[PDB]
Amino acid sequence: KHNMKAFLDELKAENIKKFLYNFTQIPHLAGTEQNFQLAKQIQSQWKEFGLDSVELAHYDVLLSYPNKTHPNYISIINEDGNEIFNTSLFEPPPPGYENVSDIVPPFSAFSPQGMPEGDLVYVNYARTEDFFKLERDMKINCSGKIVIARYGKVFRGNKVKNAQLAGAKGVILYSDPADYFAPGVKSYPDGWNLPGGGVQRGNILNLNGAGDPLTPGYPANEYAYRRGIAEAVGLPSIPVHPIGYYDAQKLLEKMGGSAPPDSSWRGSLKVPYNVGPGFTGNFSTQKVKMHIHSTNEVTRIYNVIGTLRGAVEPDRYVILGGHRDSWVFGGIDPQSGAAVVHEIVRSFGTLKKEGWRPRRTILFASWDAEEFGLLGSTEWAEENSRLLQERGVAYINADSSIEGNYTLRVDCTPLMYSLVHNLTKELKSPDEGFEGKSLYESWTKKSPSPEFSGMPRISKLGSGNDFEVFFQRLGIASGRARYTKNNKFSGYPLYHSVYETYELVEKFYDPMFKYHLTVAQVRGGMVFELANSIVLPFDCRDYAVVLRKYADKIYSISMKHPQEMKTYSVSFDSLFSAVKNFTEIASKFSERLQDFSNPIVLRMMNDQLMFLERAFIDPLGLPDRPFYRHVIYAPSSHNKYAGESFPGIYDALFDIESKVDPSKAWGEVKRQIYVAAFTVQAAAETLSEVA
Amino acid sequence: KHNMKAFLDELKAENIKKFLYNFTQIPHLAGTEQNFQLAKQIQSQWKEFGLDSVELAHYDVLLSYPNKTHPNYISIINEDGNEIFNTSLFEPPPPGYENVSDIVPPFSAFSPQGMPEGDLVYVNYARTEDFFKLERDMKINCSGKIVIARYGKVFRGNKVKNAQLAGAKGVILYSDPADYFAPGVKSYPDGWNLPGGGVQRGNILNLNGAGDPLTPGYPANEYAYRRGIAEAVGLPSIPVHPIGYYDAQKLLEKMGGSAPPDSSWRGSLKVPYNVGPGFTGNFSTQKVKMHIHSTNEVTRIYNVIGTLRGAVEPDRYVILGGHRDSWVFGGIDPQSGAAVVHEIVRSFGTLKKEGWRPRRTILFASWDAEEFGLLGSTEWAEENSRLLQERGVAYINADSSIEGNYTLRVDCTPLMYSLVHNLTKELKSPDEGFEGKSLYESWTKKSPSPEFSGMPRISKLGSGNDFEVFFQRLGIASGRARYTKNNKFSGYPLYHSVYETYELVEKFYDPMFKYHLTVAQVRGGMVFELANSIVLPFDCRDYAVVLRKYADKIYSISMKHPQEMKTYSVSFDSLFSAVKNFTEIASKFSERLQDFSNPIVLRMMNDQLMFLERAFIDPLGLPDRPFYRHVIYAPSSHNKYAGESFPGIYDALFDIESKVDPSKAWGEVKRQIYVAAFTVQAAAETLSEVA
Numbered sequence A, B: 001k002h003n004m005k006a007f008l009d010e011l012k013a014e015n016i017k018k019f020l021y022n023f024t025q026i027p028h029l030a031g032t033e034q035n036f037q038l039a040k041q042i043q044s045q046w047k048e049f050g051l052d053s054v055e056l057a058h059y060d061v062l063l064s065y066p067n068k069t070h071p072n073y074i075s076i077i078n079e080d081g082n083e084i085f086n087t088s089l090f091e092p093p094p095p096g097y098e099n100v101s102d103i104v105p106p107f108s109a110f111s112p113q114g115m116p117e118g119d120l121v122y123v124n125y126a127r128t129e130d131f132f133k134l135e136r137d138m139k140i141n142c143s144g145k146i147v148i149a150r151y152g153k154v155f156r157g158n159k160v161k162n163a164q165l166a167g168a169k170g171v172i173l174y175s176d177p178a179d180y181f182a183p184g185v186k187s188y189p190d191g192w193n194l195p196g197g198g199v200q201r202g203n204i205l206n207l208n209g210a211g212d213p214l215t216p217g218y219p220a221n222e223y224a225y226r227r228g229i230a231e232a233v234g235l236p237s238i239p240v241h242p243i244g245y246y247d248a249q250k251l252l253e254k255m256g257g258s259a260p261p262d263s264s265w266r267g268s269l270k271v272p273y274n275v276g277p278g279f280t281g282n283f284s285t286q287k288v289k290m291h292i293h294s295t296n297e298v299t300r301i302y303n304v305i306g307t308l309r310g311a312v313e314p315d316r317y318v319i320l321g322g323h324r325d326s327w328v329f330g331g332i333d334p335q336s337g338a339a340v341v342h343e344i345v346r347s348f349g350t351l352k353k354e355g356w357r358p359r360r361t362i363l364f365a366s367w368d369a370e371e372f373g374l375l376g377s378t379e380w381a382e383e384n385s386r387l388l389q390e391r392g393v394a395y396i397n398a399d400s401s402i403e404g405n406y407t408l409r410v411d412c413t414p415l416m417y418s419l420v421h422n423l424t425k426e427l428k429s430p431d432e433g434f435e436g437k438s439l440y441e442s443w444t445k446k447s448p449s450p451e452f453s454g455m456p457r458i459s460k461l462g463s464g465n466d467f468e469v470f471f472q473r474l475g476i477a478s479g480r481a482r483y484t485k486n487n488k489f490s491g492y493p494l495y496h497s498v499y500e501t502y503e504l505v506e507k508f509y510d511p512m513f514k515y516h517l518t519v520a521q522v523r524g525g526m527v528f529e530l531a532n533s534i535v536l537p538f539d540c541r542d543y544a545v546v547l548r549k550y551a552d553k554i555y556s557i558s559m560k561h562p563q564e565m566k567t568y569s570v571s572f573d574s575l576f577s578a579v580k581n582f583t584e585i586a587s588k589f590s591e592r593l594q595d596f597s598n599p600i601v602l603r604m605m606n607d608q609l610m611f612l613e614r615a616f617i618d619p620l621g622l623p624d625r626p627f628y629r630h631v632i633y634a635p636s637s638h639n640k641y642a643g644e645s646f647p648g649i650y651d652a653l654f655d656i657e658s659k660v661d662p663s664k665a666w667g668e669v670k671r672q673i674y675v676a677a678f679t680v681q682a683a684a685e686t687l688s689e690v691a
């Protein structure tokens, strides 16, 4: 038979390994020839594997690259302007790759050019609260200073935005061993830790869902009208550059001024972690000087889009997508995900060659330019938004399959919780000590839910990956799953470094490719059930439970300000009412879905399930973030990787005790409560009987 | 049998007459008790007629009313401040109504309060080009002047906006006999002409699709957060008041300064039509003084919403809607439309009682507060936008059934052209001289298309009626039809006056109610086919033909500026390409629709037809008009009643030779060409094979 078991059994660890090796021998940086060649290869293979159609969708988007003949670096400069110390021009290449060409040196993509010189201020992780501590509590002024911040905790674009608004004139990002060197493990090539010469690449945009900086709202096709650079979305206004911890030690060791305010500000280097302005007495006249010469350049990118046409509902799309561009070799990020997608396509294609077709259409995507701001997925979604809006069932992401080897990690919409619980109960655990036990059992034991006993942790979707446009802009039910470590937002130690190689994975992460195989079963299994189940496998009652938890949480935040809630008559009654109504209606809808031979009622009902995530979309978007339209979830305004619930109310309450016009600030809290209550009620009403 | 013929034959002229009489004995001003009572009556009758459910949907919206104890009026004031002439405090009531209470006196709804005094400037119709002529050609400065404008040609809100931007400190609107007194017909009560004491009420907002001024985007429900008045949408900043032509004669007869620039500026009164500033020498020291004391007040309004559940596709909605609130008695506007809807409901209910149900769900609506800015329909659509977005097949409007007795008038989306042509070929003409001929034949003879031989005129939808939110905001295929005169935007002579009575209609417009019956057949017939046809009766190829005509037209406008198109490289190639592609794809889709027992393919195909109008929606809206989202059609920025095609490009080109930075202005033209070409291509792609 052709059922999910047939699909799952066809998946092979050995194939995932072969594909990973194949995808990671040379760099595949977005906009380069090597990445176009890999695009064409995947297009050819997906055709051979059996898909109905496989096309490249290309766009011309703003990318950013260092100047090959004018390298980026940072100096300590003495009183006469002699550069007495320079940071590295490249990461030492790993064994056997020392002759690979076209390894892009470390740089912060989209940094403007400049050569700012000044005194350093150390800002810990450069979080919103780190800057509050400096400015409000320690009275340190960052204006006209070069800030040095350690990577970790939040997306680097948020760090740069926060430094910019503090008045910094440049930002230096570095990897501290406290966050990127696990105790008792060796540096790469002998273990999975970051060496002191290693450096994390990454873009520093603040696009808030816009896609290509030059074409917000519309695909960057051949006739697109582009904004000028000065009106581009999301570009930083000060130079930025990342360095390793050998170099950081040299910049930090001389730091003077104030001591760190407490131990949460001290990393693991043998330096005091003084916050500064500037260096200690002997060196008080030395300054730090950046030299940044990278250029932004409109460059063609290529998505591969494969279609397996549905036998019964070809106008319903279940999408499995992940990116293909990498900073260097992409051994984990993204190729451990891409190899998984490739083997899923192969397995579905095997069934198809035996005469099977899924009920609904499955679309497979190899996105480009994810590393430069989710550009490939976003431009494609902009181009196809009307098809996706009216036909998109679900989107499953497929970036890195592993970031550890401890247990499963799933982040998804509540609509998919039951599907995930059920699927994982049917899959074998790959974990040592759980042989013959289900994945559900090992996962629940290692990652217990903080709310529910005997349930595994499933997180909200944040952002920093290609599901953003589908979920937060378009309101298509989305999910992601990977193997993870025992933290969360900093990246594994060799994240976005030249050391992320095939050997890293094969030697230290997943020698048997059993965790990759388990991830292929979870992602592929989800796609299979979404594309094949007669009734869409969404449970609206799970959304009701979570909405109540989020309503309690946002209410609790507001209740830190009881006097203001009295003065301004701030009531959450409408929101709790809406959540109660959603709970009641969802219960009744579930009864009809269980209690209803009628394909019209069925599909009516499948349409109600598909459009439920869609109902949380507000076409006016969130304040000053028009591409974040989901009212229940948005990327945190302080950390793009993290999800925030009731973001419009959350942001209206954030730091409210500091606003100069409390009447106006509390009015806006009330406005956002109205918007949230209305949207919850409206979503509930889509589940009522239709007439 | 239960087919369209059964439905149509059940409709009776005599019933329409009885209902019109019933709806027009007392005023039904929005927000008043009398209008709530009529709401409850219609709700009860629709229940008795057989609908499945009939509910009131209420909202609390900003309305505007004169102060009963402090009347509005205008004076000529002499040098000492003596008021030597005052305009009327009320219209003389018609025969037999001189003891009716609660007739609202003439006023401009939403005018602010004020008592401005100044010299008059006469501005013809106060159109954009009238102000261009005054300011640019005649060098007359309106700053700090009271402007006097004749009604006609464009929506009065546009007049007031144009006066405000010219710097006027007040606006006086009046009805000129040239526009409101047809040669050779008597004044009311002895004919259908406007008497000199008659005055046209009407709101002067510029809401651009927003609905309730205080709650743009969201329904004005019980917990809604409201903007403060100073941030309300669309309110005028200068006092405004309308008067009749006896009063206007007294204000205009003394006018001095410049002569009218040409005869298109002269009405029919025995005055010179001098443009002024101020009065002739003897009276140079007399001024004009307004006294406006109306107040804006949040007030409850009530929509009646009736449902006839579909037997096969209950989650597809075909909506017949028109408003119920009137300025006074509403003899034509809206009750000639409401009586028609009432008889349609009765007829569908008769079939339903015999066991019939339409294929799709039909929703019937009696909207409130249309006269105050389309408030009832818009708030309801805001509340239900997710249901309408995903389930709305079509909206047929049903305001005034007659504005003349000459021939049919239809304005609709191209998707409904074929449906209208076909239906009218099956209906009998009511016209004298066409007995035994079809409505199509009489209509085509009396109102020939300017493009096509042997085809009738069908206009684009503009605005100024309740279809605006459904069509221009939500992208639901919409249409309207009424009997009309042999002009177009000024209103019939007794429009919005106390003289619009049952007797007006029964005596002078439609004594036999045969034109009302013909309109009931066209509106009801359309609803019947939309709700019952197995394949939705839309023809996408008709959109292709019109898109080419609009592309030619906008290209021709740009080509008035050949040097600028060369300098700035302004190409329409992408738009013509998109239109060509749409034509090609629509042709193929039509072949499949003809060539396809399979309910999934059918409904797939019906979904492609239903979502085609939806595809022209841009979620970012038009520049500074976020609620006008349709890229092909928007209300003219110079006249809300009129539709404009390719409005984003049209507005970018308008008066472009006057812009100070031509580079920037032409850049914006190019941007709007990109947006239009992309949206046309995207819409075309929704008609491609789905996978």
Ligand SMILES: *[C@@H]1O[C@H](CO)[C@@H](O[C@@H]2O[C@H](CO)[C@@H](O[C@@H]3O[C@H](CO)[C@@H](O)[C@H](O[C@H]4O[C@H](CO)[C@@H](O)[C@H](O)[C@@H]4O)[C@@H]3O)[C@H](O)[C@H]2NC(C)=O)[C@H](O)[C@H]1NC(C)=O
Residues within 6 Å of the ligand: A574, A575, A577, A578, A581, A677, A678, A681, B222
């Ligand atoms: C959750 O679902 C429930 C339905 O089960 C829904 O209940 C509705 O609540 C509204 C708002 O409270 C009710 O609105 C009332 O409607 C009556 C007429 O039906 C009006 O007379 C009421 O107005 C009077 O009272 C107000 C409050 O004191 C005054 O402000 C006002 O001036 C009037 O004097 C009021 O508008 C509505 O009737 C019910 N509908 C029902 C029971 O079917 C509730 O709103 C849902 N929650 C959300 C967040 O949508």
Ligand SMILES: *[C@@H]1O[C@H](CO)[C@@H](O[C@@H]2O[C@H](CO)[C@@H](O[C@@H]3O[C@H](CO)[C@@H](O)[C@H](O[C@H]4O[C@H](CO)[C@@H](O)[C@H](O)[C@@H]4O)[C@@H]3O)[C@H](O)[C@H]2NC(C)=O)[C@H](O)[C@H]1NC(C)=O
Residues within 6 Å of the ligand: A222, B574, B575, B577, B578, B581, B677, B678, B681
């Ligand atoms: C109407 O439908 C047609 C399809 O029938 C569609 O045609 C497409 O036009 C685009 C834009 O012209 C073509 O894009 C080209 O794609 C090739 C690869 O396929 C590229 O190599 C081309 O780029 C080169 O040439 C450009 C122009 O000189 C250069 O600017 C560029 O730097 C490159 O050197 C170019 O991107 C596309 O191939 C066709 N698709 C087909 C034929 O299927 C057309 O776009 C539709 N109209 C609209 C308004 O969408």
Ligand SMILES: *[C@@H]1O[C@H](CO)[C@@H](O[C@@H]2O[C@H](CO)[C@@H](O[C@@H]3O[C@H](CO)[C@@H](O)[C@H](O)[C@@H]3O)[C@H](O)[C@H]2NC(C)=O)[C@H](O)[C@H]1NC(C)=O
Residues within 6 Å of the ligand: A418, A419, A422, A537, A538, A539, A594, A595
């Ligand atoms: C995850 O798996 C669970 C457990 O199988 C699924 O829940 C079960 O779903 C079935 C099918 O709808 C339910 O059966 C129904 O029961 C009622 C009797 O009350 C009957 O009227 C129906 O005809 C049908 O037999 C079953 O009760 C239910 N079990 C539960 C909720 O405990 C669940 O649907 C799966 N989730 C998915 C697929 O998203």
Ligand SMILES: *[C@@H]1O[C@H](CO)[C@@H](O[C@@H]2O[C@H](CO)[C@@H](O[C@@H]3O[C@H](CO)[C@@H](O)[C@H](O)[C@@H]3O)[C@H](O)[C@H]2NC(C)=O)[C@H](O)[C@H]1NC(C)=O
Residues within 6 Å of the ligand: B418, B419, B422, B537, B538, B539, B594, B595
């Ligand atoms: C308005 O009425 C016209 C005239 O009846 C309708 O057009 C006609 O529609 C029928 C039904 O689709 C077409 O018949 C088809 O013809 C082809 C043969 O080429 C055949 O393959 C199909 O099986 C079917 O018989 C007919 O050709 C067509 N006539 C035309 C276009 O001249 C039109 O659909 C109506 N518009 C509506 C209902 O919106």
Ligand SMILES: *[C@@H]1O[C@H](CO)[C@@H](O[C@@H]2O[C@H](CO)[C@@H](O)[C@H](O)[C@H]2NC(C)=O)[C@H](O)[C@H]1NC(C)=O
Residues within 6 Å of the ligand: A022, A025, A040, A041, A044, A045
């Ligand atoms: C990755 O695998 C692909 C496909 O097996 C290899 O590409 C093939 O290479 C052979 C030898 O050059 C050619 O004859 C085929 O035409 C290629 N097939 C394609 C591109 O579809 C590719 O060599 C492998 N890359 C690495 C680094 O091993």
Ligand SMILES: *[C@@H]1O[C@H](CO)[C@@H](O[C@@H]2O[C@H](CO)[C@@H](O)[C@H](O)[C@H]2NC(C)=O)[C@H](O)[C@H]1NC(C)=O
Residues within 6 Å of the ligand: A075, A081, A082, A083, A084, A085, A086
């Ligand atoms: C850091 O790099 C800079 C730039 O290459 C070095 O400074 C240059 O040294 C060369 C050779 O002596 C001079 O000709 C250039 O004029 C210098 N350029 C600048 C910008 O100062 C510097 O020597 C390096 N410092 C260290 C410690 O190696």
Ligand SMILES: *[C@@H]1O[C@H](CO)[C@@H](O[C@@H]2O[C@H](CO)[C@@H](O)[C@H](O)[C@H]2NC(C)=O)[C@H](O)[C@H]1NC(C)=O
Residues within 6 Å of the ligand: B022, B025, B040, B041, B044, B045
């Ligand atoms: C319009 O018609 C309605 C319905 O026929 C009339 O309302 C009815 O009036 C009688 C006498 O008062 C009552 O017994 C019924 O309860 C009413 N029915 C309703 C409201 O559904 C109404 O009188 C008529 N109005 C005019 C001006 O003739």
Ligand SMILES: *[C@@H]1O[C@H](CO)[C@@H](O[C@@H]2O[C@H](CO)[C@@H](O)[C@H](O)[C@H]2NC(C)=O)[C@H](O)[C@H]1NC(C)=O
Residues within 6 Å of the ligand: B075, B081, B082, B083, B084, B085, B086
């Ligand atoms: C126009 O109306 C105004 C306002 O009612 C009249 O002026 C008033 O006249 C009364 C009675 O003489 C005075 O007590 C008030 O002080 C006046 N009010 C104002 C505002 O001037 C005026 O007489 C009327 N003019 C004409 C020509 O009838």
Ligand SMILES: CSC[C@H](NC(=O)N[C@@H](CCC(=O)O)C(=O)O)C(=O)O
Residues within 6 Å of the ligand: A202, A203, A333, A370, A371, A372, A373, A374, A399, A400, A463, A464, A465, A488, A489, A490, A491, A640, A641
């Ligand atoms: C810290 S894990 C983040 C990783 N995501 C990414 O690296 N995304 C890229 C690009 C994200 C973006 O531009 O939104 C990045 O964070 O620099 C993942 O989701 O696996």
Ligand SMILES: CSC[C@H](NC(=O)N[C@@H](CCC(=O)O)C(=O)O)C(=O)O
Residues within 6 Å of the ligand: B202, B203, B333, B370, B371, B372, B373, B374, B399, B400, B463, B464, B465, B488, B489, B490, B491, B640, B641
């Ligand atoms: C000149 S005919 C206009 C008539 N429409 C209306 O009167 N609409 C009302 C309200 C329109 C609006 O506020 O958009 C008006 O124009 O004042 C109609 O469409 O029959």
Ligand SMILES: *[C@@H]1O[C@H](CO)[C@@H](O)[C@H](O)[C@H]1NC(C)=O
Residues within 6 Å of the ligand: A067, A068, A069, A070, A295
């Ligand atoms: C790279 O640097 C060298 C030195 O300025 C220069 O010749 C070239 O313009 C630069 N390339 C760019 C800016 O793309």
Ligand SMILES: *[C@@H]1O[C@H](CO)[C@@H](O)[C@H](O)[C@H]1NC(C)=O
Residues within 6 Å of the ligand: A141, A142, A143, A144
């Ligand atoms: C920080 O220093 C700058 C640089 O002179 C100054 O302009 C700014 O006002 C300072 N801000 C505070 C809070 O002291």
Ligand SMILES: *[C@@H]1O[C@H](CO)[C@@H](O)[C@H](O)[C@H]1NC(C)=O
Residues within 6 Å of the ligand: A192, A404, A405, A508, A509
């Ligand atoms: C794999 O698992 C082992 C055993 O717990 C752990 O010690 C090792 O470091 C893991 N590898 C990685 C990269 O986490």
Ligand SMILES: *[C@@H]1O[C@H](CO)[C@@H](O)[C@H](O)[C@H]1NC(C)=O
Residues within 6 Å of the ligand: B067, B068, B069, B070, B295
């Ligand atoms: C109406 O006018 C009289 C006189 O100002 C006044 O008593 C009352 O306040 C007014 N009503 C309003 C402003 O609603």
Ligand SMILES: *[C@@H]1O[C@H](CO)[C@@H](O)[C@H](O)[C@H]1NC(C)=O
Residues within 6 Å of the ligand: B141, B142, B143, B144
């Ligand atoms: C119109 O008159 C006003 C009033 O003094 C003046 O301020 C304004 O600049 C004038 N505009 C023109 C075009 O003359």
Ligand SMILES: *[C@@H]1O[C@H](CO)[C@@H](O)[C@H](O)[C@H]1NC(C)=O
Residues within 6 Å of the ligand: B192, B404, B405, B508, B509
């Ligand atoms: C009705 O039709 C007649 C005949 O053409 C016309 O003269 C009369 O004025 C019409 N009534 C109205 C209100 O147009």
